[PDB]
Paper text:
The N6-threonylcarbamoyladenosine (t6A) modification at position 37 of ANN-decoding tRNAs is one of the few modifications that are found in the three domains of life. In the first half of the reaction, YrdC utilizes ATP, L-threonine and bicarbonate to synthesize an unstable intermediate TCA, whose threonylcarbamoyl-moiety is subsequently transferred onto the adenosine at position 37 of the substrate tRNAs by the cooperative action of three proteins [name], [name] and [name]. In archaea and yeast, the transfer reaction requires the kinase, putative endopeptidase and other proteins of small size (KEOPS) protein complex, composed of Kae1, Bud32, Cgi121 and Pcc1, complemented by a fifth fungi-specific protein Gon7 in yeast. It is now well established that [name] and its orthologs Kae1 and Qri7 are responsible for the catalysis of the transfer reaction. [name] and [name] are forming a heterodimer that is capable of interacting with [name].
We wanted to analyze the importance of the Mg2+ ion, by mutating its Glu12 carboxylate ligand into alanine. The crystal structure of YgjDE12A–[name] in complex with ATP determined at 2.3 Å confirmed the absence Mg2+ in the active site. Interestingly, this mutant has ATP bound at the active site compared to ADP for the wild [name]–[name] type although no binding of AMPCPP to YgjDE12A was observed by ITC. [name] probably has a very weak ATPase activity, which is inhibited in the YgjDE12A mutant, explaining why we observed ATP at the active site of the mutant. Moreover, there was no electron density observed for ADP at the YgjDE12A–[name] interface, suggesting this site could have a preference for ADP rather than ATP. We observed that the in vitro t6A activity of YgjDE12A is totally abolished. However the ATPase activity of the ternary complex YgjDE12A–[name]–[name] is not affected by this mutation. These data further confirm that [name] is responsible for the t6A coupling reaction and YgjE for ATP hydrolysis.
Residue numbers in the entry:
A (entry chain A): 1 to 336
B (entry chain C): 1 to 229
Write the structure that this text describes.
């Protein structure tokens, strides 16, 4: 089969076509990054407006790219949440009505299930069961995954998620929003150990996370130290290493608790080159395996929605004529 | 020709069908329900009309202004249908729609349309029907504070009819304007009143491909303050 997948949950418009035989037939993406960069965050109304300008043309360009016509599409999938109500509504109305007009089933997709499954799009997808690390802008969870929709929350952040933590310390360092990818690059020219940040919630057992203490620890360090590019880079690396090591330690503990030998890494922060190497090294020493998506599928993208749409269609999750979005949509609520 | 019209720019949901002059129309109030009602209603009106989506020659949609969220529901649902069924699209102003409704209901030909835009402001338009049934005044559409509407009405003369939630929120909008103001008995736009406008636009070749359909928000200063620098 073939599933058209539509992603507009936040600040990026994504359209893909997934073929369960041939693979990925189309991938289209428009990022609104420079729309919101002057505001220091995503302005909801400006996001909602640009999705209206991009959704349809990107859909046209995906069918055009793929050389496919409407009859070649067996289902239409769209992100129903979580995300900005305003953004999610663009993708879901176009999607629901496009499926109505094509007379094919419509498939509402959970955005985080999307990230979680994106690694299934590479060579050698992980088999169930696995531990999953979901590290994004607003979410940082450890999950025990035994199958589709069998997602048990092992751990989560009680305050800032890792991504926002990267974005907030990146801003203190004077970088564009979102600065997480830019702090990481800045940190590449940092001296290891020059500064030493805490690894939060690693002195007691447990699998929950806390990162808000790192912003303060970074801010305080930038304030008592030089402004030369090198010292800035030294703080950036101190911050990265701290986050990466915190996530690593937590992943270890979750693999220990569950007994699983497979670690799935997901969300925007999973693009982080330092965290990829580190997780990959740890699973070697454990005689197990790490899985993550190509960097482009870590951040928001339509391809993961065309895939998870495919998966949920096979699992019976079609929608009636109603359209509904869920800006807050707990992963725990997805049925099996 | 056949025309399908849908609208969700305000608290109402409506769909209407025109079949070479014979009209099928449905209207109801949908506060907080638009996405749960809109596609079921398109389906109702197709089936009860014995017409399929592929029979339709043009899709008309309420283009704005109104609720940003409602305006996008309308355009998004319409784009999907048109994309999906390969239909050309016709964007109809919600202010002009309510003016047509006034014309329909009591023969009004001079309409002051005001929508509650919230934030102390109203979406404003002065529409006037010519002998041939065409509405003039599309250039007058704006989002305005009550005091600037007052200044606008001072440049106007005569008798006008009033339509839209605007006057419902500001009943003394035209106080000391110098005009004779009559209630136009139209609170909200109805897809049925899109049809005749849609028809004339269709005749003169004013239909666009799905990718050209655009909302009209009027209020464009929607963002918080830029960062220092
Ligand atoms: N190379 C990188 N290093 C660190 N962080 C990164 C990197 N690349 C992306 N990110 C982070 O990824 C986030 C965006 O990814 P994603 O879309 O998963 O999160 P989100 O949409 O904010 O989260 P949620 O889905 O919980 O709302 C940003 O916080 C960004 O800083
Ligand atoms: Fe995301």
């Amino acid at each position: 089969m073939r599933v058209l997948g539509i992603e507009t949950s936040c600040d990026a418009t994504g359209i893909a076509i997934y073929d369960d035989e041939k693979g990925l037939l189309a991938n289209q993406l428009y990022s609104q990054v420079k729309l919101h960069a002057d505001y220091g965050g995503v302005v909801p109304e400006l996001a909602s407006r640009d999705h209206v300008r991009k959704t349809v043309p990107l859909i046209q360009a995906a069918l055009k790219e793929s050389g496919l016509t409407a009859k070649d599409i067996d289902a239409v999938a769209y992100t129903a949440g979580p995300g900005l109500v305003g953004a999610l509504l663009v993708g879901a109305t176009v999607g629901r009505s496009l499926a109505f007009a094509w007379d094919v089933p419509a498939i509402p997709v959970h955005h985080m299930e999307g990230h979680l499954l994106a690694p299934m799009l590479e060579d050698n997808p992980p088999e169930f069961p696995f531990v999953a690390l979901l590290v994004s802008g607003g979410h940082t969870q450890l999950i025990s995954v035994t199958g589709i929709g069998q997602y048990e929350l092992l751990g989560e952040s009680i305050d800032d998620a890792a991504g926002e933590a990267f974005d907030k310390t990146a801003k203190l360092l004077g970088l564009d929003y979102p600065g997480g990818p830019l702090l990481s690059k800045m940190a590449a020219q940092g001296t290891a150990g020059r500064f030493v940040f805490p690894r939060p919630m690693t002195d007691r057992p447990g699998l929950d996370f806390s990162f808000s203490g790192l912003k303060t620890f970074a801010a305080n360090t930038i304030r008592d130290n030089g402004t030369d590019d090198q010292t800035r880079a030294d703080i950036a690396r101190a911050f990265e290493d701290a986050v990466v090591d915190t996530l690593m330690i937590k992943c270890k503990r979750a693999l220990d608790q569950t007994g699983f030998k497979r670690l799935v890494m997901a969300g925007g922060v999973s693009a982080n080159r330092t965290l990829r190497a580190k997780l990959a090294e740890m699973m070697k020493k454990r005689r197990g395996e790490v899985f993550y998506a190509r960097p482009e599928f870590c951040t928001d993208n339509g391809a993961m929605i065309a895939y998870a749409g495919m998966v949920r269609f096979k699992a019976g999750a079609t929608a009636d004529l109603g359209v509904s979005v869920r800006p807050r949509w707990p992963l725990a609520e997805l049925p099996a | 020709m056949r025309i399908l019209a849908i609208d969700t720019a305000t608290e109402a949901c409506s769909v209407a069908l025109w079949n070479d002059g014979t009209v099928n129309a449905h209207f109801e109030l949908c506060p907080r329900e638009h996405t749960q009602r809109i596609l079921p209603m398109v389906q109702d009106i197709l089936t009860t009309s014995g017409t399929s989506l592929t029979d339709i020659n043009a899709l008309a949609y309420g283009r704005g202004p109104g609720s940003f969220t409602g305006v996008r529901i309308g355009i998004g649902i319409a784009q999907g249908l048109a994309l999906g069924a390969e239909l050309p699209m016709i964007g109809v102003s919600t202010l002009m729609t309510m003016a047509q409704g006034a014309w329909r209901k009591n023969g009004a030909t001079r309409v002051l349309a005001a929508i509650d835009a919230r934030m102390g402001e109203v979406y404003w338009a002065e529409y006037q029907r010519d002998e041939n049934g065409i509405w003039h005044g599309e250039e007058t559409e704006a989002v305005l504070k009550p005091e600037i509407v007052h200044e606008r009405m001072q440049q106007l003369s005569g008798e006008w009819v009033t339509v839209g939630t605007g006057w419902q929120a500001w009943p003394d909008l035209g106080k000391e304007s110098g005009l004779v103001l009559r209630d136009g008995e139209v609170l909200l736009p109805a897809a049925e009143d899109m049809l005749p406008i849609a028809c004339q636009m269709f005749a003169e070749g004013k239909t666009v491909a799905v990718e050209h359909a655009e909302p009209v928000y009027l209020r464009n200063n929607v963002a918080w303050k830029k960062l220092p620098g």
